Every structure is written in C-alpha cells, then in structure tokens.
Amino acid sequence: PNPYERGPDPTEDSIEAIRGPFSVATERVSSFASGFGGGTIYYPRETDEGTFGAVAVAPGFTASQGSMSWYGERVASHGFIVFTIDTNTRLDAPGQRGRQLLAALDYLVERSDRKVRERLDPNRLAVMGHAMGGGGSLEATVMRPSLKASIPLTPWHLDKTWGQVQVPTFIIGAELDTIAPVSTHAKPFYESLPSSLPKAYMELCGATHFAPNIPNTTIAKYVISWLKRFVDEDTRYSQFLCPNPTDRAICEYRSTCPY
Numbered sequence: 001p002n003p004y005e006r007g008p009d010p011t012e013d014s015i016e017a018i019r020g021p022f023s024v025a026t027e028r029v030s031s032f033a034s035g036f037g038g039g040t041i042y043y044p045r046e047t048d049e050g051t052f053g054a055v056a057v058a059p060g061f062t063a064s065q066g067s068m069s070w071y072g073e074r075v076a077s078h079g080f081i082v083f084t085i086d087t088n089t090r091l092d093a094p095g096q097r098g099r100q101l102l103a104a105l106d107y108l109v110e111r112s113d114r115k116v117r118e119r120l121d122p123n124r125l126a127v128m129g130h131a132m133g134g135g136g137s138l139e140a141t142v143m144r145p146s147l148k149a150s151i152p153l154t155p156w157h158l159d160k161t162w163g164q165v166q167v168p169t170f171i172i173g174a175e176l177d178t179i180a181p182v183s184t185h186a187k188p189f190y191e192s193l194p195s196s197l198p199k200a201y202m203e204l205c206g207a208t209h210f211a212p213n214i215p216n217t218t219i220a221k222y223v224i225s226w227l228k229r230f231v232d233e234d235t236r237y238s239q240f241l242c243p244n245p246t247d248r249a250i251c252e253y254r255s256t257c258p259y
C-alpha cells in the first residue's frame with residue numbers, strides 16, 4: 001500500500017474531469033512575502049486520507065497568477081496543494097523565477113498557515129511554470145534537486161543545456177509557438193535532459209504560446225498524471241503516461257518509459 005495514494009482509482013475520464021474528488025479551499029498570500037510576490041494557495045479540504053504534496057506554479061514574462069489560475073481548482077481537486085504565485089516584478093527573468101518558485105515552496109514549509117501546514121507533506125514538492133516561468137521551473141530543479149517533479153509549460157530560456165537535472169521533468173510545447181519555438185526551446189531542453197531522467201515531451205497540435213493560460217483538457221489530464229506518479233509515487237497513474245499517450249490533440253510525444 002502506497003502511503004501517498006489519494007482519491008479513488010483513476011480513469012481517463014477522471015483525469016480529464018474539470019473537478020476532482022476533493023473539495024478545494026483557497027487562501028491569499030500577501031505579495032510582501034519574503035522571496036516572491038505572494039500568490040494564492042489551493043488546498044484540499046478533506047484530511048482523513050493524509051497530507052498532500054504541493055506544487056508552486058509560476059507565470060510567464062509580464063504575467064500574473066491570473067494567467068495560471070485555472071490550474072488551482074483543477075489540480076488541487078485531485079489531491080494536491082497548488083500555489084499560483086506572482087513574481088517580485090513582472091519583468092523577472094527565468095533565473096529569478098526559479099528562485100521565487102523555491103521561496104514559494106519554502107513559505108509553504110516554514111511560514112504557512114496552520115490550515116495549510118497541517119495538510120502539507122514538506123518532503124514532496126514540485127514546480128510548474130509557463131514560458132519564462134517554465135524556464136524558472138528548469139532553474140528550480142538545478143537549484144533544488146530534491147524536488148519531486150517539474151512541468152515547464154511552453155518554456156522559454158536562453159540556456160539550452162540541462163544535462164544535470166535530476167528531477168522528473170515533463171515539458172509541454174505548442175506546435176505553432178513563435179515566442180518560445182519548440183525547435184529552439186522546448187525540444188532542445190528535453191533532448192538535453194539526461195537520457196536516464198524520467199522525462200516526457202508533449203507537443204500540442206496547432207497550439208500557440210499562451211495555450212497553457214486557458215483551460216486545456218490535454219494539459220490537465222497529463223499534468224495531473226505526472227504529479228500523481230512522481231509526487232505521490234502513485235503507480236495507478238502510470239497507465240496514462242506509459243506507453244506514450246495517443247491523444248489527437250498531441251502532435252508529438254517523446255518519453256523515457258518505463259519509469
């Protein structure tokens with residue numbers, strides 16, 4: 001029995017559903033928090049199944065947490081703590097956004113409310129980011145290799161080599177992305193990840209740079225599965241990740257299955 005498994009046995013319908021089995025409560029964190037510009041914590045109300053893991057979600061260049069708000073109720077209702085954060089300034093670079101993703105996770109572990117702290121397993125943390133926040137997601141794993149998962153969403157970064165990343169990384173790219181072209185960003189990041197790293201690359205057909213900013217079932221179903229598999233060690237979700245998904249919305253998928 002996995003001590004981290006939460007919720008009933010999943011199906012493809014359950015991971016695609018807009019609402020998971022857990023009721024969600026929210027809390028506002030002031031932007032004057034140390035190390036980052038505040039945000040909103042989405043946590044499950046139910047507590048009788050055990051403490052949950054947490055993921056901090058970073059926005060892109062000049063964007064706020066509102067561009068990532070739909071991940072809050074979507075992911076947290078499946079049994080996770082979600083921290084959609086704002087950066088110190090809207091002009092922050094990927095390297096700075098990686099530091100503030102860690103500062104957001106440290107706030108959850110060290111200085112969070114007792115409603116949040118009681119529901120948090122501080123040993124199982126993850127990061128997720130959009131574009132420049134996706135570059136900061138890669139940065140956060142190099143800065144903290146003890147992280148359990150990492151999901152760069154249409155990532156943007158000047159550094160193309162990530163052969164020292166030790167955290168399971170799930171890169172999602174948009175085929176028609178011209179701001180962070182997958183040929184020069186998303187794919188070079190994935191191919192430079194260690195060949196032995198538990199990694200995956202999902203390219204969405206005909207998607208643009210800001211597709212992760214609105215509800216997307218294809219993004220939602222496999223972001224949930226990736227967090228479940230590596231933050232919860234929940235092998236009940238390995239069926240959705242290995243072998244490679246065959247969704248019509250996916251134009252290309254690469255992975256190092258089995259995990």
Ligand SMILES: O=C(O)c1ccc(C(=O)OCCO)cc1
Nearest residue numbers: 060061062063131132133156179
């Ligand atoms: O012009 C760029 O280099 C550049 C432009 C935009 C971004 C970015 O993070 O897009 C997401 C904003 O919501 C990254 C780099």
Ligand SMILES: [N+]
Nearest residue numbers: 250251252253
């Ligand atoms: N595919």
